[PDB]
């Protein structure tokens, strides 16, 4: 499951760059770094929430 979560967060920041919202992308990237060091899956929920605010 962790592998899919990392892929989803990665795709979210990639999209945020494409959408022209670099600050949101930067914030999501930070979620990736923290995620790769932890078992905390709520970082996905934050990546998704940030994307929803942008879209």
């Amino acid at each position: 499951d962790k592998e899919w979560i990392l892929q989803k967060i990665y795709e979210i920041m990639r999209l945020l760059d494409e959408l022209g919202h670099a600050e949101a992308s930067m914030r999501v990237s930070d979620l990736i770094y923290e995620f790769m060091k932890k078992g905390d899956e709520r970082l996905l929920e934050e990546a998704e929430r940030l994307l929803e605010e942008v879209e």
Partner: protein
């Protein structure tokens, strides 16, 4: 039980082995929020309610 009037089972004063349910292939989904799903056998809770 129905979703409107759900049941609550009290889990207390025991060993809670979560490896059976974690490894079981009979379940379609699992998600933990405040805890890591792989640390459940290291953790201890005041009481557990199912």
């Amino acid at each position: 039980a129905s979703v409107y009037a759900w049941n609550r089972k009290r889990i207390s004063n025991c060993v809670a082995d979560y490896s059976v349910l974690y490894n079981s292939a009979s379940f379609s989904t699992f998600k933990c929020y405040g805890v890591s799903p792989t640390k459940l056998n290291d953790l201890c809770f005041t009481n557990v309610y199912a």
